[PDB]
Design a protein around this nucleic acid. Structure first.
Ligand SMILES: Nc1nc2c(ncn2[C@@H]2O[C@H](COP(=O)(O)OP(=O)(O)OP(=O)(O)O)[C@@H](O)[C@H]2O)c(=O)[nH]1
Ligand SMILES: [Mg+2]
Ligand SMILES: [Zn+2]
Lengths: 213, 69, 24, 263, 91
RNA sequence: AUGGUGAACUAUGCCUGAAUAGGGUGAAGCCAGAGGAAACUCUGGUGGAGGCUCGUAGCGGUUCUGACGUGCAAAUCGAUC
RNA sequence: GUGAACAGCCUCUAGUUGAUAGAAUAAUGUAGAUAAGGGAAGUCGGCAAAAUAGAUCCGUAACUUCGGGAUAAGGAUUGGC
RNA sequence: AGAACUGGUACGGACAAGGGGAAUCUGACUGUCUAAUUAAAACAUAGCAUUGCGAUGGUCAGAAAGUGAUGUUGACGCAAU
RNA sequence: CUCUUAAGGUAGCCAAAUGGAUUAACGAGAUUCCCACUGUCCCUAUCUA
RNA sequence: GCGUUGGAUUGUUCACCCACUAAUAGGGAGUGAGCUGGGUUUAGACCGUCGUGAGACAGGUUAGUUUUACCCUACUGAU
């Protein structure tokens, strides 16, 4: 019995990510003193297409408060932001499209994206192109906040966590039909080598638990 | 196992009282009626030893001459 | 026998059934 | 061999069905066997089946079964995997035989008929997939095969049969789907047949040949319209006629025989 | 003159791939390649390149937007949804 | 069974390089002319799109009662594709 | 130079003129040619060969996912001055 | 592009260069594979369908580990078909 | 315990233009034929390397 | 003694028909190394049947490499 394909992924020999041209790991700004007491102001310098991602990214800079320099961040672009637009970031930031805020600050009924699970981990939920969350409930008592995910699932988290106003740019990417295998070829060459897939029934009984007959 | 043991299965049916007439190749599938029915697709053969002396005749070929009174 | 209705069955639209093609 | 198919499947099957062309079931009744059915296998069944009902007008096939229910049960039917008619009446029909033959542990049914009638086709649209081989040519299935469904009812598909009656035809063997029309020697000479069968109006629409007479002339208007003429300047008599007679059998020209009148 | 009857830009795929899919793509790839008005210049100079990225030709200001049109309808109503939620908290 | 050596062949992903005559067809966009209130519909170009096509190099290896069967060759040679 | 052309073809510059030979012209071979009259009767089977072929112009059907089919088919032409 | 004139059995004169048609079955197609007997309807594909999972997670890896692949990832996604 | 046959004048009612997979295109895929064509053959002959 | 054919047909031909002719007699030793077509027949693939399955098959369909001679003898010609 030969070791089957999905078990052979666990080595990650060739199955790692094709990662030469990824612009940088998109995260939120580190949750620091200023963001948890006041706001701060940054500037998008440019937005750019990232290979292996439907969502375009955004190069936003901030001035370092603890030292004279400029440190640069990478955000996933909400739809409607333009170059040179200022972006406010903090607890005391106002609600405008593209700012990052705590969740406990907004009214419910708000539509945000790139939201943290636990506070501080720089944003792990609702990051695909055109997804988001909506805030459905504030429990100020033992402060929690209940929302609903793009999968339809509803989940409460802490009120301390962060997210950025508005939905991710790049919706409707999956509506266009790719029409031929070459575009499917140029898709997966940037992501990983799980393409093309040989069907399980076509293989031999050494290969896969379907094969034979 | 151990739930998939033929000992354990035949206790679950309560069919352990028979013993000496259980048939080779009986599974969770394939009752003893079925197994004899399946084996006749292969059992059209004769048996010879290393010599080869004819051990047991092929099916429906028993070659003896009956006394037809 | 089951009772058998013919209100269904759009019959096969041959070209000779169409008056769109005709001479005159 | 081709009748060695036939006595095999008749002796194999329990209930026989018998398909018939809706265009001219009288030309297809082929009695001849029913004779053998009544006299030697009284327990066997012999039901008729009218397939290809989508080639006749609506009331026409309606008139036929009234002239056919008096002797045989005779379902109407249209065979297609994806857009059929009358499947579930037959599915209701068969299981009764499996019901009535309770002890019999299973039951066969073989499909008898002329070639090129849909015997292979009907089984496919029963099984809702392609299991028999099918073709617009007549002699497509070559040897009977078991096709199992519901573990008790078995479908059998003999190749098509022509009874060896003297006459009863010479040319109307072309006017049933029997003969692969290619191997015939002079396809030019049977053209006034299809003038006699088909209606001039419906014929006029399918080409779209305007006024003619004298069916040799009818060919020569067409081969001009097809540009189907030989090198300087012979109009193709044969292959055009071969293209004509296919359409009479593949179902591109509309035709049928008038059913016997009510009284 | 009007060269094609009903395929237009989809005639570059010629015959293949089925007529239903080509009728979908023709709806999209016009919107992929059409010009659009700048909200900043005021000029019909907005162009996609590398979807999700929409630059005006003039003034080089560039708006992150939908993949095959500048603003999708989805964020368009989100804007006014925010506008409602903004001034409700303002008053 | 125990303990070892191999990806120069070949398989597959990645990195950085390199290579690919001349034809045929004529997508979108655009212009003109004629109609139409408009939508637009004709007519004549411009344009040079395509996992298009003819067809070298290149790659592949279909067909032949091929050649050769101690062959030049432990898979070559011809023509055809 | 020919020509649509790094094709095929023939020259220049440059480089080789190496592959055991000599003599005769049987059969059968290998490779390649030709044919009266007939035109697939051969053969399991048109296998193989023949036939077509560049460009200009005339003309072009059913079918169809309207994009094709399509060089459809079939015609008429081609020097030199 | 047109015309005279002219030789002729030849006028894309060698070289180069599609035979065509009617139909059926079959798989959509470009693709790919048994190096050395099989190039196909086999496989892959776009499309379609379904299941799984909100990270203290999914599917795997590792003798172990303060260990790894997906993952510089977050359901318009990943994984399984 | 009880039961299932009505449709008629050469193309129909109907359904949001069609009623189909009897699917275009494509293929060193499997197959039948027609024209053209010819040493495939009648029946062999001749020439060169 | 000498004669004893041409064909059509594989949805098959363990054959038949139609024609010529004097007539289309029946066999034997055959011609599996003279050549082949079907079939030895292996790996590929599809459909059907059966099996829980690997797979087998009541079948059916397609693609699929053995390659001598110079020796002894016979044989035909030759010294
Ligand atoms: N109009 C119409 N045509 C049909 C129908 N069913 C079959 N056909 C056509 O009839 C032809 C014959 O189908 P087959 O199944 O091959 O007929 P068959 O007699 O079973 O074939 P064989 O048994 O081999 O002679 C097919 O090519 C179909 O085109 C039908 O229901 N309606
Ligand atoms: Mg048939
Ligand atoms: Zn601008």
């Amino acid at each position: 019995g030969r070791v089957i394909r999905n078990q052979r992924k666990g080595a990650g020999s060739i199955f790692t990510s094709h990662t030469r041209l990824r612009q940088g790991a998109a995260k939120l700004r580190t949750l620091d003193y200023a963001e948890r007491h006041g706001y701060i102001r940054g500037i998008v310098k440019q937005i750019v297409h990232d290979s292996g991602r439907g969502a375009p990214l955004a190069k936003v800079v901030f001035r370092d408060p603890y030292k004279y320099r400029l440190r640069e961040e990478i955000f996933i672009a909400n739809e409607g932001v333009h170059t040179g637009q200022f972006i406010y970031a903090g607890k005391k930031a106002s609600l405008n499209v593209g700012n990052v805020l705590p969740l406990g600050s907004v009214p419910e009924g708000t539509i945000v994206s790139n939201v943290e699970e636990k506070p501080g981990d720089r944003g792990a939920l609702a990051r695909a192109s055109g997804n988001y969350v909506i805030i459905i409930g504030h429990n100020p008592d033992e402060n929690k906040t209940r929302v609903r995910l793009p999968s339809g699932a509803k989940k409460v988290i802490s009120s301390d966590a962060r997210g950025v106003i508005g939905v991710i740019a790049g919706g409707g990417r999956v509506d266009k039909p790719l029409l031929k295998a070459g575009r499917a070829f140029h898709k997966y060459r940037l992501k990983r080598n799980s393409w093309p897939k040989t069907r399980g029934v076509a293989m031999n009984p050494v290969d896969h638990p379907h094969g034979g007959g | 196992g151990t739930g998939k043991k033929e000992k354990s299965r035949r206790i679950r049916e309560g069919d352990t009282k028979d013993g000496n007439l259980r048939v080779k190749g009986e599974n969770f599938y394939r009752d003893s009626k079925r197994v004899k029915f399946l084996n006749m697709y292969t059992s059209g053969k004769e048996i010879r030893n290393k010599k080869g002396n004819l051990i047991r005749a092929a099916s429906f070929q028993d070659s003896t001459i009956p006394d037809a009174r | 026998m089951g009772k058998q209705d013919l209100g269904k069955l759009q019959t096969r639209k041959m070209k000779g059934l169409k008056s769109k093609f005709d001479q005159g | 061999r081709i009748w060695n198919e036939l006595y095999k499947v008749i002796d194999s099957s329990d209930v026989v069905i018998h398909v018939l062309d809706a265009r001219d079931p009288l030309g297809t009744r082929c009695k001849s066997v029913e004779e053998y059915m009544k006299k030697e296998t009284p327990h066997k069944h012999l039901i008729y089946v009218l397939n290809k009902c989508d080639l006749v007008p609506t009331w026409v096939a309606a008139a036929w079964v009234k002239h056919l229910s008096k002797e045989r049960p005779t379902l109407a039917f249209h065979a297609s995997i994806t857009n059929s008619f009358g499947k579930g009446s037959l599915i209701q029909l068969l299981r009764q035989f499996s019901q009535l033959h309770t002890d019999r542990k299973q039951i066969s049914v073989g499909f008898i008929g002329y070639p090129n009638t849909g015997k292979s086709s009907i089984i496919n649209t029963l099984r809702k997939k392609k299991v028999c081989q099918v073709a617009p040519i007549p002699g497509e299935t070559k040897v009977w095969q078991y096709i199992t469904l519901m573990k008790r009812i078995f479908l059998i598909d003999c190749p098509g049969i022509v009874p060896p009656s003297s006459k009863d035809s010479e040319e109307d063997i072309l006017f049933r789907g029997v003969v692969r029309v290619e191997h015939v020697t002079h396809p030019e000479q049977y053209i006034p047949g299809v003038l006699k069968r088909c209606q001039v109006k419906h014929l006029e629409r399918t080409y779209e040949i305007s006024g003619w007479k004298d069916a040799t002339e009818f060919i020569e208007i067409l081969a001009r319209k097809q540009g189907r003429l030989l090198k300087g300047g012979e109009p193709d008599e044969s292959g055009v006629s071969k293209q004509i007679l296919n359409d009479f059998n593949r179902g591109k020209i509309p035709w049928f025989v008038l059913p016997p009148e009510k009284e | 003159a009007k060269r094609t009857k009903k395929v237009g830009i989809t005639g570059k795929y010629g015959v293949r791939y089925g007529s239903s899919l080509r009728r979908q793509v023709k709806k999209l790839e016009i919107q992929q390649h059409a010009r659009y008005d700048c909200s900043f210049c005021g000029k019909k100079t907005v162009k996609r390149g590398a979807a999700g990225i929409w630059t005006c030709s003039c003034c080089k200001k560039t708006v992150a937007g939908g993949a095959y049109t500048v603003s999708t309808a989805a964020a368009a109503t989100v804007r006014s949804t925010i506008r409602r939620l903004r001034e409700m908290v303002e008053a």
